[PDB]
Design a protein around this ligand. Structure first.
Ligand SMILES: *[C@@H]1O[C@H](CO)[C@@H](O[C@@H]2O[C@H](CO)[C@@H](O[C@@H]3O[C@H](CO)[C@@H](O)[C@H](O)[C@@H]3O)[C@H](O)[C@H]2NC(C)=O)[C@H](O)[C@H]1NC(C)=O
Ligand SMILES: *[C@@H]1O[C@H](CO)[C@@H](O[C@@H]2O[C@H](CO)[C@@H](O)[C@H](O)[C@H]2NC(C)=O)[C@H](O)[C@H]1NC(C)=O
Ligand SMILES: *[C@@H]1O[C@H](CO)[C@@H](O[C@@H]2O[C@H](CO)[C@@H](O)[C@H](O)[C@H]2NC(C)=O)[C@H](O)[C@H]1NC(C)=O
Ligand SMILES: *[C@@H]1O[C@H](CO)[C@@H](O)[C@H](O)[C@H]1NC(C)=O
Ligand SMILES: *[C@@H]1O[C@H](CO)[C@@H](O)[C@H](O)[C@H]1NC(C)=O
Ligand SMILES: *[C@@H]1O[C@H](CO)[C@@H](O)[C@H](O)[C@H]1NC(C)=O
Ligand SMILES: *[C@@H]1O[C@H](CO)[C@@H](O)[C@H](O)[C@H]1NC(C)=O
Lengths: 183, 195, 322
C-alpha cells in the first residue's frame, strides 16, 4: 500500500532507472510496475504473483481415473515454491510435489511420464507433445509422430508402373443446414 | 465395408454431431442466462414490481432489461457466425454434388483420396454424406526407362505413354497400368534426328 | 480468463461477478473453438501425405537445380534457403499481455515439423511426380516429368527434349530471382504481416480498455470501495463491471470474424496444395499467371507461400490460316 497505491505481487530488485523526480513506473498496459520505497531510495519492481491457466489431461472417465495436469506459461521450478497452505487456490497441491514432471514450451505437465519413443497424436498439448493412455496403464506424453518415413529409390533411368489396381470406396461428410430457430 | 465403418464407432459422424450440439447447447445457455440477476436486487420481474416503488423499480428493471436484451443479442450474433460457416459448407457440398456426383472431376484430392471414378450421395440428418469411388494403383514393379528412342538415325517418341524395358528389349505402355506393346510406328511420331 | 481480467486481486469484486452467471463462461467456450481450429487448419493444409519422403543424396535432376528450395542440412534447423528469407522478413510488451490474463498458447504443430512436411511435399513432386498424391509413390526421371506436364499443357513432349538445357538454365535463373524479389521489398509479405498485426493490434485495445472509466468515479477497481459508501458502491461498480464485460464481448465477436476470414483462406490453400502442388490443374489462372507446370510449397510464419512454375508463351509470328 505504498502511499495509498494498493496492489498485490512480488517485488524484486529493478535495474530500471528513475529520475529523482519520478515516483511510479507504468507499462504499456497502463498500470504501476515499479515503486520507490520512502525509507530506501532503491527502486522496487512490482509484478503479479505466480498464476496461469490450469489444464487437466484426462482419458475417458470410464476408461480410467488418473488425470495428468499441465500448467500453462510458468517455469516448472516456480510451482514447487507456490506450495503452501492458504497460499494456493487449488487444494490439490499434491501434484506440485507429484510424479515425474516434463517441461515443454506450454509449461510443464505433471502426472504423466514423458516417453521418448514416437506415437501418433491422441490428445493435443502443443509444441509437438501429445499425451495418451497407453501401457500398468498410465498417461504418457510423447513427441508428435508424422508417420513412418519412406525413402524413394529415384534414378535418372528408372520408372515404376503399377501392374495392378484396386477400387476403394472413401466416405466424406459435410453439414448442409442447422435447425431453424426463432425467439 | 462402408456399412460397418460408419457404425463401428460414433466418431465417424463427428462433423454432423457438433452442428446439432452447438445449437442445442447455445439454447441451454440462453435459457440459463435469464436466471442471472444482472446486478439487480432479484431475477424475477414480478417480485421487483411487488416490492419496489415504481419511481425506482424502473432502475432495478433497467439493469435487467438491458442485461437480458444484450444477452439475447449475443446469441443472435453467435448464430450469424454459424450461418456464415454452414453457408461456406453448403456451397462446398453443392460443388461436390455438382462435380463429384453429376460428373467426373480430374481435380486431385477433391472427390476422394486418389483418382476419382464416381460418387453416390446419401441423405443425412442436417447434412449430406458422399460415397466416393476411387481408383488406387496397387503393387507396382519398377522398370528401366528411356525418354526417347532412335531407330533410323531419327528420334522416336511415345504418342501417348512411356517407354519401358524388362531388360532385353523395350516396350510402350500406359501410365497407370503395365500393358506392354511392341514398338510400332502407329504409337510413335518422329521429331528430328537423335543427336 | 474471467475473474482476474475483470476483478483481479480483488475478492470484493470476483464475488459479485458470479451474479452475471455463465455469461463469460461462454467466452472461454467461444475462444476455445477458435484455438483448436488453428491446430486444425494446419492439420489439413501441410499434412496431406501419410509418408515422410526423403530426397536422394544427389541433387542432379537432369540439369534442374533445386538447391534453393530443398531443405538445407548446413543450417541447424531443417529450413530451405527460401524459408530463411520468409522467416526473417516476418516479424511477430508481450509479457504485459500475460499479466492481464491474455495468454498466447503455442500451436500443436511446432515450426520444426512444418518445414518437415514441406520437405516431404518437395520430396515427392520432384522424384515421384504427382502420383504420390493418389496412392503408392512411383519414381520417374525428372527429365521425363516435364514431358508429362508439357503433355497436359498442349505441346507435344518433343519440344522438351529438344530444349532441355535451355529450359533448365531458364528455370535456374527464374528461381534465383525469387530470392532477390522476396527480399527486394517488405510489402511482398504484406498478406502475412497484417494477420499478426491485426491480432497484435486487437490486444492493444483490450489491455488499454480496462483503464477506461466507463462513466465511473475512477477506473481503478479498488479505490471505488475505499472512497465511496457501500450503499451505492454496487451500482457504482456495476457499470464498471459491464464496461469490461461488454468490451470483452466486442473483442471475441470480432475475433470470430477474423477466424472466418482465415478459415476461408485455410480451405483455399488446402485446395491449392491438393491441386497446384500434388498435380497439374486445368483451372486457368488459378495456380499462377499462365499455363501451369507444377508448384512447390514453402512454409512461412502463420502462413504458407507457394512457388508456382508457370509456362508463358514468348514472342509470336502471326500467320495466315484456313
Ligand atoms: C522380357 O520380355 C520379353 C518379351 O516377352 C521376353 O522375351 C520372350 O521370352 C519368352 C520366354 O521368356 C520367349 O518365349 C519362348 O521363345 C523360345 C524361342 O525359341 C521358344 O522356343 C519357346 O517355346 C517360348 O515361346 C519369347 O520368344 C521371347 N521373345 C522373343 C521376341 O524372342 C524376355 O524373356 C523377357 N525377359 C525377362 C528377364 O523377363
Ligand atoms: C544450384 O544453385 C546454387 C545457387 O547459386 C549453387 O550454389 C553455388 O555454388 C557455387 C559453387 O562454387 C558457389 O560458388 C556459389 O556461391 C553458390 N551459390 C550461392 C548462392 O551460395 C549450386 O552450386 C547449384 N547447383 C548445381 C548442381 O548447379
Ligand atoms: C527463345 O527464348 C530464349 C530465351 O527466352 C532464347 O534463349 C536465349 O537465346 C540467346 C540468343 O540465342 C542467348 O544469348 C541466351 O543465352 C539464351 N537464353 C538462355 C537462358 O539460354 C532462345 O534463343 C529463343 N529461341 C528462339 C528460336 O527465338
Ligand atoms: C465409457 O467410456 C468408454 C471409453 O473408453 C466408452 O467406450 C463407453 O461407451 C462409455 N460408456 C458410457 C458413456 O456409458
Ligand atoms: C526456468 O528458467 C530457467 C532460467 O535459467 C531456464 O533455464 C529454464 O529452462 C526454465 N524452465 C522452464 C520450465 O521454463
Ligand atoms: C529414451 O528412453 C529410455 C527409456 O525411457 C532411456 O533408457 C533412454 O536413455 C532414453 N534416451 C535418451 C536419448 O534420453
Ligand atoms: C544419372 O546421374 C548421375 C549423377 O551425375 C550421372 O553420373 C549419370 O550419368 C546419370 N545417368 C545417365 C543415364 O546419364
Amino acid at each position: 500500500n505504498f502511499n495509498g497505491l494498493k496492489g498485490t505481487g512480488v517485488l524484486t530488485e529493478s535495474n530500471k532507472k528513475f529520475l529523482p523526480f519520478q515516483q511510479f513506473g507504468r507499462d504499456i498496459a497502463d498500470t504501476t510496475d515499479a515503486v520507490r520505497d520512502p525509507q530506501t531510495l532503491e527502486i522496487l519492481d512490482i509484478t503479479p504473483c505466480s498464476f496461469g491457466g490450469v489444464s487437466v489431461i484426462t482419458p475417458g472417465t470410464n476408461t480410467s481415473n488418473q488425470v495428468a495436469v499441465l500448467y500453462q506459461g510458468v517455469n516448472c521450478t516456480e510451482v514447487p515454491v507456490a506450495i503452501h497452505a492458504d497460499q494456493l487456490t487449488p487444494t490439490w497441491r499434491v501434484y506440485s510435489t507429484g510424479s515425474n514432471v516434463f517441461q515443454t514450451r506450454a509449461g510443464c505437465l505433471i502426472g504423466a511420464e514423458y516417453v521418448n519413443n514416437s506415437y501418433e497424436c491422441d490428445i493435443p498439448i502443443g509444441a509437438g507433445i501429445c499425451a495418451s493412455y497407453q501401457t500398468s496403464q498410465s498417461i504418457i506424453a510423447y513427441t508428435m509422430s508424422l508417420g513412418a518415413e519412406n525413402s524413394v529409390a529415384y534414378s535418372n533411368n528408372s520408372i515404376a508402373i503399377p501392374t495392378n489396381f484396386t477400387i476403394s470406396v472413401t466416405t466424406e461428410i459435410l453439414p448442409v443446414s442447422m435447425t431453424k430457430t426463432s425467439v | 465395408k462402408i456399412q460397418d465403418s460408419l457404425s463401428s464407432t460414433a466418431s465417424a459422424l463427428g462433423k454432423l454431431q457438433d452442428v446439432v450440439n452447438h445449437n442445442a447447447q447455445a439454447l441451454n445457455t440462453l435459457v440459463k442466462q435469464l436466471s442471472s440477476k444482472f446486478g439487480a436486487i432479484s431475477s424475477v420481474l414480478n417480485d421487483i414490481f411487488s416490492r419496489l416503488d415504481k419511481v425506482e423499480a424502473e432502475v432495478q428493471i433497467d439493469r435487467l432489461i438491458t442485461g437480458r436484451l444484450q444477452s439475447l443479442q449475443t446469441y443472435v450474433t453467435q448464430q450469424l457466425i454459424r450461418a456464415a460457416e454452414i453457408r461456406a459448407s453448403a456451397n462446398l457440398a453443392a460443388t461436390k454434388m455438382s462435380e463429384c456426383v453429376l460428373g467426373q472431376s480430374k481435380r486431385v484430392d477433391f472427390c476422394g483420396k486418389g483418382y476419382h471414378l464416381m460418387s453416390f450421395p446419401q441423405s443425412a440428418p442436417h447434412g449430406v454424406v458422399f460415397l466416393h469411388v476411387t481408383y488406387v494403383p496397387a503393387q507396382e514393379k519398377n522398370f528401366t526407362t528411356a525418354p526417347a528412342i532412335c531407330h533410323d538415325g531419327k528420334a522416336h517418341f511415345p504418342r501417348e505413354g512411356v517407354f519401358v524395358s524388362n531388360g532385353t528389349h523395350w516396350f510402350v505402355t500406359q501410365r497407370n497400368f503395365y500393358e506392354p506393346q511392341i514398338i510400332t510406328t502407329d504409337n510413335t511420331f518422329v521429331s528430328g534426328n537423335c543427336d | 480468463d474471467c475473474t482476474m481480467y475483470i476483478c483481479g486481486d480483488s475478492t470484493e469484486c470476483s464475488n459479485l461477478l458470479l451474479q452475471y452467471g455463465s455469461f463469460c463462461t461462454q467466452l472461454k467456450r467461444a475462444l476455445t473453438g477458435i484455438a483448436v481450429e488453428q491446430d486444425k487448419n494446419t492439420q489439413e493444409v501441410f499434412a496431406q501425405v501419410k509418408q515422410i519422403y526423403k530426397t536422394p543424396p544427389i541433387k542432379y535432376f537432369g540439369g534442374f537445380n533445386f538447391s534453393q528450395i530443398l531443405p538445407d542440412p548446413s543450417k541447424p534447423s531443417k529450413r530451405s534457403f527460401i524459408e530463411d528469407l520468409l522467416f526473417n522478413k516476418v516479424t511477430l510488451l508481450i509479457c504485459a499481455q500475460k499479466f492481464k490474463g491474455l495468454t498466447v498458447l503455442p500451436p500443436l504443430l511446432t515450426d520444426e515439423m512444418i518445414a518437415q512436411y514441406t520437405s516431404a511435399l518437395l520430396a515427392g513432386t520432384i522424384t515421384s511426380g504427382w502420383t504420390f498424391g493418389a496412392g503408392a509413390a512411383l519414381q520417374i526421371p525428372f527429365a521425363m516429368q516435364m514431358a508429362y506436364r508439357f503433355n497436359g499443357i498442349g505441346v507435344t513432349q518433343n519440344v522438351l527434349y529438344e530444349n532441355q538445357k535451355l529450359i533448365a538454365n531458364q528455370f535456374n535463373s527464374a528461381i534465383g530471382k525469387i530470392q532477390d524479389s522476396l527480399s527486394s521489398t517488405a510489402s511482398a509479405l504484406g498478406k502475412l504481416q497484417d494477420v499478426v498485426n491485426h491480432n497484435a493490434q486487437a490486444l492493444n485495445t483490450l489491455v488499454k480498455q480496462l483503464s477506461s472509466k466507463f462513466g465511473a468515479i475512477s477506473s481503478v477497481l479498488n479505490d471505488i470501495f475505499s472512497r465511496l459508501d457501500k450503499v451505492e458502491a454496487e451500482v457504482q461498480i456495476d457499470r464498471l463491471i459491464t464496461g469490461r464485460l461488454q468490451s470483452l464481448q466486442t473483442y471475441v465477436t470480432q475475433q470470430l470474424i477474423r477466424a472466418a476470414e482465415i478459415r476461408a483462406s485455410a480451405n483455399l490453400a488446402a485446395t491449392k496444395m491438393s491441386e497446384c502442388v500434388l498435380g497439374q490443374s486445368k483451372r486457368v489462372d488459378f495456380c499462377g499467371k499462365g499455363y501451369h507446370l507444377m508448384s512447390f510449397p514453402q512454409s512461412a510464419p502463420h502462413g504458407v507461400v507457394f512457388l508456382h512454375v508457370t509456362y508463358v508463351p514468348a514472342q509470336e509470328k502471326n500467320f495466315t490460316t484456313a
